[PDB]
Each structure stands twice: as structure tokens, then as C-alpha cells.
């Protein structure tokens, strides 16, 4: 079957920053750049 990333999904970076996936806000109310093109993923700086 296909594994379409949902909620309980977890993903990390090549740098070792692992983390689950909480809510998946729609592109609608998603922080966007002054010229359209909204964001994709929001990481919390506190983990830096």
C-alpha cells in the first residue's frame, strides 16, 4: 500500500534534528512570503 504522510509521521534532517508531525495546516492560512508562495514546513527555533 501507499504511505501518505499523515499525523503520527516523524521526520528528521541530515543534521540530527528529529521530530514528529503535529498539525498540518492547509496552504490557506499558511505563513506566506509577501509575493504569494506560502511556506512549506515550520520548524521551531528552540530546537537550535
Amino acid at each position: 500500500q501507499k504511505r501518505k504522510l499523515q499525523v503520527g509521521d516523524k521526520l528528521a534532517n541530515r543534521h540530527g534534528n528529529k521530530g514528529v508531525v503535529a498539525k498540518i495546516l492547509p496552504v490557506e492560512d499558511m505563513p506566506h512570503l509577501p509575493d504569494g508562495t506560502p511556506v512549506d514546513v515550520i520548524l521551531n527555533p528552540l530546537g537550535v
Binding site: 490557506e28 504569494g36 508562495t37
Partner: protein
């Protein structure tokens, strides 16, 4: 003086609109409110389900066919169509070519009303004697819809897909300064929208604004 609603349409895709002058930072109380709906309410078109002759599951592959199932299926949702009547709530096209050739979306069999604004879309390619046979179900719903949420069964061995309506690529609003009026603390809202092809900027515009209006009435009967 009244806020002039101008338009600078440039084709079927791009669509810029200007609204000025505007009160104390009102352009913002409009740019976002509308924009939001503009990308989550505007109804579009997409591929609902498909059924290939020589196929059982979406994780298979057909001889003589370069790209595998999933590969093509993906290039399908990338397609865009345009209906010409509120009745075309459910339309299904079909296509099947053979021998060496680029499987373009255009190669489909025209279905009068409904039109395809996505001609060049390279869906797949057939080597030699590629048994290309499918059933492309198309619907005009709203927003995104999980392929495992609707479960379209046009045929016993057909596999549904995901909704890719919302004829909006990206929207943005600019709340520049004023141009007229003895007051400089005014606004000039101007939004630029992009549509896949189904509905032109204007179309999308009116719609959203209307959905808004209608909503405003719900605040009638108190408690």
C-alpha cells in the same frame, strides 16, 4: 469619490485588480480575507479515478510502456480541464495510442463541452506497440480530497485518486499607499492571482466575494 475597481487582465491565467482609495489600512482587511477563500473554496477540476485494461493495481507496469503506473497517474492530476455548463458535474474521457510517440493529454478524444487547457502535458511514452488503455474519470468538486476518502469505483479494478481542484496556484495582496485624496493615510489594495486554466481570475474573484456576502447573512436570527 468611490473606490474604483479597475482590472488589468493579461490572459486566462494572470489576473491583477486594483481597488483604491481605501480607508485606514482597509486594503489588508480585504486582501487576506478574500485571498484565503480564494485558494480553499474555488471549485476546479481533477482526475477522480482511472482504470487501465492491462492493470490490476496502481503499483504495476505495462509492457511497451516507459513510465510505470504511479508515474503516469501523477502526470494526470497535473492535468486541467474546463467545463462549459453547470451540468458537467461528472465527465469521463478516454485515449489510447500505440507505437513510438509522446503521450500528450491533447491526444484525448474531444468531448464537446469540456475542454482541456493542458495540451503539452507529457503523461507518458510508448516504446513499440504499447498497450495504452485507460478510463479517466473527471469531476468538479472543491478543494483537496483523499483518494482513500471517496473511493471511486468506475470499474471493479479501477483505482481512485486525489482531488486537485482549486484553480489557484498562488495569491498575494499589496496594501500600497494612497494615490488620490487630500489624506495620505489611505490604502490601494491590489491582488494578483494565478489560475490553472479552469476559471479566469475574474471568475474566481466574483465567486469568493459572493461566498463572503452570503456568509454575512448567517448573522441574522439572534438567540
Amino acid at each position: 469619490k468611490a473606490p474604483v475597481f479597475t482590472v488589468r487582465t493579461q490572459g486566462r491565467e494572470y489576473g491583477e485588480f486594483v481597488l483604491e482609495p481605501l480607508e485606514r489600512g482597509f486594503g489588508v482587511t480585504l486582501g487576506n480575507p478574500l485571498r484565503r477563500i480564494l485558494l480553499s473554496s474555488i471549485p476546479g477540476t481533477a482526475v477522480t479515478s482511472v482504470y487501465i485494461e492491462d492493470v490490476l493495481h496502481e503499483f504495476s507496469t505495462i509492457p511497451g510502456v516507459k513510465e510505470d503506473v504511479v508515474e503516469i497517474i501523477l502526470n494526470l492530476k497535473e492535468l486541467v480541464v474546463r467545463f462549459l455548463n453547470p451540468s458537467l458535474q461528472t465527465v469521463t474521457l478516454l485515449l489510447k495510442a500505440e507505437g513510438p510517440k509522446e503521450v500528450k493529454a491533447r491526444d484525448f478524444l474531444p468531448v464537446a463541452d469540456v475542454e482541456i487547457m493542458n495540451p503539452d502535458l507529457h503523461i507518458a511514452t510508448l516504446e513499440e506497440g504499447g498497450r495504452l488503455n485507460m478510463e479517466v474519470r473527471v469531476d468538479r468538486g472543491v478543494g483537496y480530497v483523499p483518494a482513500e476518502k471517496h473511493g471511486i469505483k468506475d470499474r471493479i479494478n479501477a483505482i481512485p485518486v486525489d482531488a486537485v481542484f482549486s484553480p489557484v496556484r498562488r495569491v498575494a495582496f499589496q496594501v500600497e499607499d494612497t494615490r488620490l485624496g487630500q489624506r495620505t493615510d489611505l490604502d490601494k489594495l491590489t491582488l494578483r492571482i494565478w489560475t490553472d486554466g479552469s476559471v479566469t481570475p475574474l471568475e474566481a474573484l466574483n465567486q469568493a466575494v459572493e461566498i463572503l456576502r452570503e456568509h454575512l447573512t448567517y448573522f441574522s436570527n439572534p438567540q
